[PDB]
């Protein structure tokens, strides 16, 4: 039910979004 | 010829085995002479090998005596002199 949806979100999608945001933050100015 | 020296070795197997045992036993006892009490302080002024032919130390003299036996005058490979 939930694990099949939550594990890809926490293990792949959230790290990707956080990495993209952090990279755009550190490359500013 | 090979099958003549095979005959020679057949007749002298026991004698050569007694040479092997003596020469290995002397080689081992060379490291144990002092503990045995054979070659030590007052008589080791020269080599225990030298004492072997003048004092008859137990194990280094059996090898000397057996070393050449049944061999000719100039055909013992373990002693240059043998029967000079």
């Amino acid at each position: 039910n939930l694990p099949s949806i939550f594990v890809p979100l926490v293990g792949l999608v959230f790290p990707a979004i956080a990495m993209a945001s952090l990279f755009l933050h550190v490359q500013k100015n | 010829v090979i099958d003549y020296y095979l005959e020679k070795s057949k007749a002298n197997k026991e004698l050569n085995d007694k040479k092997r045992l003596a020469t290995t036993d002397a080689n081992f006892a060379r490291a144990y002479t002092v503990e045995f009490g054979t070659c030590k302080f007052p008589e080791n002024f020269t080599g225990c090998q030298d004492l072997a032919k003048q004092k008859k130390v137990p194990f280094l003299s059996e090898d000397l005596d057996i070393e050449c036996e049944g061999k000719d005058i100039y055909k013992c490979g373990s002693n240059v002199f043998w029967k000079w």
Partner: protein, 162 residues
């Protein structure tokens, strides 16, 4: 005598050398005719070509070496994996474009040829040009993955390795 290796563009104090690998007419023509070096054309079409090549090439490894390679559904699963890789690559391209180029700034590409002749710098090194390039890359890559799947598992052509 006759030496083959020469300093780059005749300048001995630029950190490069001219070798047959780098300066032969065949390789020079081949590199000049790749979509990555077509300066005077819309970057969107170049990105379309690049994506069409790369997404098409990416299908094979996923389909054949994947965990479900021995399943009857291996082709579709591998094509989906290749499409996901294309999506990730497009995300990386968009990230690089946003981080590297501001909207108003001009191009960072060189404005001189090897002969010193002034040219128009490549619009690919601008924000709009890079955005068009990555959009074309995404569209081409998805289409290439779909085309490889259609050729391999919809028409089932007698390819030796499938």
């Amino acid at each position: 005598t006759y030496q083959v290796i020469q300093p780059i563009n005749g300048d001995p104090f630029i950190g490069s050398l001219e070798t047959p690998i780098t300066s032969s007419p065949l390789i020079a023509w081949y590199l000049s005719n790749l979509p990555g070096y077509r300066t005077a054309v819309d970057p969107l079409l170049r990105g379309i070509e690049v994506g069409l090549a790369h997404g098409y090439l990416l299908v094979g490894p996923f389909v054949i070496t994947g965990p479900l390679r021995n399943a009857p559904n291996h082709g579709a699963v591998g094509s989906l994996g290749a499409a996901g890789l294309i999506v990730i690559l497009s995300i990386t391209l968009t990230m690089y474009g946003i981080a590297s180029f501001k909207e108003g700034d001009p191009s960072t590409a060189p404005s001189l040829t090897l002969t010193g002749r002034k040219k128009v710098p490549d619009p690919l090194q601008t924000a709009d040009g890079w955005a068009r390039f990555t959009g074309g890359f995404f569209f081409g890559g998805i289409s290439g993955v779909i085309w490889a799947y259609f050729l391999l598992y919809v028409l089932d052509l007698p390819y030796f390795v499938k």
